[PDB]
């Protein structure tokens, strides 16, 4: 049952201390490394299965593999990720371009689509707008309060 491990070398099983973001191990709580077994990267006769990936195709179709073709499941969902997917321009507006997929209830059929994100919206630009002004207003209001006091300070000597 034990899986090979990219780049151990060796044709046997060895126990490793495994950490986050490493194959053959999914940490159950942030910080948990776990000393678990792993099989060598070198192909020996002890194998149950061997995962191969086709790089170059040969002279004959393989009935179940080369011939048939299976579809991705989800399309782009971010803004520009749709734009890179359809070779569009910044000015093109996604929205009327996103992959939809039909839903068949039993008598009523409807559809559904993502929710493009990073999407530029009326609302978003209103937010940058508010922040900006917030910054300038307070800056000026600060510079009045500073100036006011620096006057109150002068009078704490003149008088």
């Amino acid at each position: 049952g034990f899986p090979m491990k990219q780049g151990v070398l060796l044709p046997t099983r060895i126990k490793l201390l495994l950490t986050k973001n490493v194959s053959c191990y999914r940490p159950r709580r942030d910080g948990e490394r776990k000393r678990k077994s792993v099989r060598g990267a070198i192909v020996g006769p002890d194998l149950a299965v061997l995962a191969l990936v086709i790089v170059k195709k040969g002279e004959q179709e393989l009935e179940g593999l080369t011939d048939t073709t299976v579809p991705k499941r989800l399309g782009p969902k971010r803004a520009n990720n749709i734009r890179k997917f359809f070779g569009l321009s910044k000015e093109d507006d996604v929205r009327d371009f996103v992959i939809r997929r039909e839903v068949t209830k039993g008598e009523k059929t409807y559809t559904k689509a993502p929710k493009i994100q990073r999407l530029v919206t009326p609302q978003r630009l209103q937010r940058k707008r508010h922040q900006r002004a917030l910054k300038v207003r307070n800056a000026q209001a600060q510079r009045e309060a500073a100036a006011e006091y620096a006057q109150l300070l002068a009078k704490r000597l003149s008088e």
Binding site: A146, E148, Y149, L153, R156
Partner: protein, 260 residues
């Protein structure tokens, strides 16, 4: 002990809250806030123990989740919020403005105030210091830090804050003859003019206090809260004007008042 404690055993709580012994194992334990946890008064004790508006603990939240209570003009929603000295607490949907201010015994008393006065607060400056970029700042006991203050305001002086805009508006110095609350100690609850600040370089200065009855008593400087001019307090005072009565004197007053 590996980190901050989160519970409080109902027994290790401040006595002045006056919670009973049996009920459950626990007392609320003040959240982190503007007041020291032993010098504070959770909104939940207020609403349910002192006010009797709540029964359950559930009902306290149910109340607070209705944004029904402002502390110093800001709606407060945390059951264990640590309100404290000079705090205001405004119960809007019933026309009530209070101000946590001490008994004579030592317990945070129900002192209602005008729909005015809930406009402001007295705040004892704790430190006054040069902040970065040369800008000065004071710090009141209630965790307020108002920048750009009057250069005459030194430490132990009190200060009139607005509320709805922060901002200091007039202030009182600390010298001989000023009207003073006693914020903690054995004399917790008393009021009265100063007389003498016994200073001791190194540690703990002593402030001899006389009241509107000529009883003298001393506490520490960290315990004195200046609240006005002799016979002129900048906040309305609870019944009995923080006087202290000998239990003899105390006995007489009850039974005589009693009857008719």
């Amino acid at each position: 002990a590996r980190g901050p404690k989160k519970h409080l055993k109902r027994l290790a709580a401040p006595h002045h809250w006056l919670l009973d012994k049996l009920s459950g194992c626990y007392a609320p334990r003040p959240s982190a806030g503007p007041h020291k946890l032993r010098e504070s008064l959770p909104l939940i004790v207020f609403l349910r123990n002192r006010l009797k508006y709540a029964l359950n603990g559930r009902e306290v939240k149910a109340i607070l989740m209705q944004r029904h209570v402002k502390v110093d003009g800001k709606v407060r929603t945390d059951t264990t919020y640590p309100a404290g000295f000079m705090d205001v607490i405004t119960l809007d949907a019933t026309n009530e403005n209070f101000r946590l201010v001490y008994d004579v015994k030592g317990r945070f008393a129900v002192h209602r105030i005008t729909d005015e006065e809930a406009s402001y607060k007295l705040g004892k400056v704790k430190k006054v210091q040069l902040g970065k970029k040369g800008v000065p700042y004071v710090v009141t006991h209630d965790g307020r830090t108002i920048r750009y203050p009057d250069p005459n305001i030194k430490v132990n002086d009190t200060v009139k804050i607005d509320l709805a805009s922060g901002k200091i508006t007039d202030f009182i110095k600390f010298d001989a003859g000023k009207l003073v609350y006693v914020t903690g100690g054995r004399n917790l609850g008393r009021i009265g003019t100063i007389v003498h600040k016994e200073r001791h370089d190194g540690g703990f200065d002593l402030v001899h206090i006389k009241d509107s009855l000529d009883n003298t008593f001393v506490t520490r400087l960290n315990n004195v809260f200046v609240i006005g001019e002799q016979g002129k307090p900048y906040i309305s005072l609870p019944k009995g004007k923080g006087i202290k009565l000998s239990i003899a004197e105390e006995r007489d007053r009850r039974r005589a008042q009693q009857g008719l």
